[PDB]
Design an enzyme around this catalytic site. Structure first.
Site, mmCIF file in Angstrom:
data_model
loop_
_atom_site.group_PDB
_atom_site.id
_atom_site.type_symbol
_atom_site.label_atom_id
_atom_site.label_comp_id
_atom_site.label_asym_id
_atom_site.label_seq_id
_atom_site.Cartn_x
_atom_site.Cartn_y
_atom_site.Cartn_z
ATOM 1 N N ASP A 143 0.844 -1.190 0.000
ATOM 2 C CA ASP A 143 0.000 0.000 0.000
ATOM 3 C C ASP A 143 0.886 1.250 0.000
ATOM 4 O O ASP A 143 1.380 1.677 1.055
ATOM 5 C CB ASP A 143 -0.916 -0.016 1.214
ATOM 6 C CG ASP A 143 -1.819 1.187 1.269
ATOM 7 O OD1 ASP A 143 -1.891 1.887 0.238
ATOM 8 O OD2 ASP A 143 -2.411 1.422 2.344
ATOM 9 N N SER A 146 -0.371 15.649 -11.886
ATOM 10 C CA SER A 146 -0.592 15.291 -13.277
ATOM 11 C C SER A 146 -0.828 16.556 -14.092
ATOM 12 O O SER A 146 -1.366 17.550 -13.598
ATOM 13 C CB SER A 146 -1.800 14.359 -13.381
ATOM 14 O OG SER A 146 -2.172 14.125 -14.728
#
Length: 330
Positions: A35, A199
């Protein structure tokens, strides 16, 4: 040193991926969910409340000659989906894919929430976010990657998750045969403890790329891709019959639909998520309403590049003094 381990989807939807981890002496192999959005390595154990164990493999520290109770240490964690677990702490030897760390904090669950009990395929989590998020008190503990870093050939790990197939976690090296083209690296902020990056924009299907900054985290422990409502609405508007369902808890679409791809930007580079990766199947057995793999982050507080996004890429988690993320197509 290096390590290399195969990671395998737990079900036919790629809801999560499990990777075998050796704990203790003799080794006890548990299948953990790696994770990158948390920083605790915790396991079902001989200490877990019996009614809360249902098929998981447990760690029994009393059977490990290298286990030592970390006196006074406790842990308690709550995840973004509302699940939780807590317990005490041992140190022990932990190996992943041939890479061994001695004295790793292994957090033994005394209690787990129902969603963990109900998933017999996941024996615990191995957190790979920054150690500042580790919940052990009163002495915070280091992640497996942090403990291994100094010994690794290079201070990196890579995630290469498969679509409906196994993939690979590598530690200490970048497998240049595992991706196409070049890896584009992008800046990381560790201020919230996550692999947080920006992004450069998105496209829906064959549509034009929209340049826009989308701050989010690279999180292998989250199934889906959670993005701003504007972006998510633009995606589902291209799927006839798709709608946001308050009762189901997100966007659903007709199972008869063909989904468009979704592209996200990494600097000047582009990662394309095929439409099929966005299909999470019937909302309930036999339904013709299917659950979408791209969902709004509006109720989260952060955008999350979960497995839907990450499995379309070869992802480098560069833990150099100034961390960065790398993405390549594959």
């Amino acid at each position: 040193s290096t390590g290399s381990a195969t990671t395998t989807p737990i079900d036919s939807l790629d809801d999560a991926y499990i990777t075998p981890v050796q704990i203790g002496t003799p080794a006890q192999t548990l299948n953990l969910d790696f994770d990158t959005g948390s920083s605790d390595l915790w396991v079902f154990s001989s200490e877990t409340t019996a009614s809360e164990v249902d098929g998981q493999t447990i760690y029994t520290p009393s059977k490990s000659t290298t286990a030592k109770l970390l006196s006074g240490a406790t842990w308690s964690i709550s995840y973004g989906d509302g699940s939780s677990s807590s317990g005490d702490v041992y140190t022990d030897t932990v190996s992943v894919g041939g890479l061994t760390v001695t004295g790793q904090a292994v957090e033994s669950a005394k209690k787990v929430s129902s969603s963990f009990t109900e998933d017999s395929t996941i024996d615990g989590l191995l957190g790979l976010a920054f150690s500042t998020l580790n919940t052990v008190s009163p002495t915070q503990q280091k992640t497996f990657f942090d403990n291994a870093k100094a010994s690794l050939d290079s201070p990196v790990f890579t995630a290469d998750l498969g679509y409906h197939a196994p993939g690979t976690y590598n530690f200490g090296f970048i497998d240049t045969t595992a991706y196409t083209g070049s890896i584009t690296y992008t800046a990381v902020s560790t201020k919230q403890g996550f692999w947080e990056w920006t992004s450069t924009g998105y496209a829906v299907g064959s549509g034009t790329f929209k340049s826009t900054s989308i701050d989010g985290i690279a999180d292998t422990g989250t199934t889906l891709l959670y993005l701003p409502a504007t972006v998510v609405s633009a995606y589902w508007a291209q799927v006839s019959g798709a709608k946001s369902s308050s009762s189901v808890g997100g966007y659903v679409f007709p199972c008869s639909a063909t989904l468009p791809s979704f592209t996200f930007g990494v600097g000047s580079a582009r990662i394309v998520i095929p439409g099929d990766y966005i299909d999470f199947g019937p909302i309930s057995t036999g339904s013709s309403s299917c659950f979408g793999g791209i969902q709004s982050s509006a109720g989260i507080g952060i955008n999350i590049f979960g497995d839907v996004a990450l499995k379309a890429a070869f992802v480098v988690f560069n833990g150099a003094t100034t961390p960065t993320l790398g993405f390549a197509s594959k």
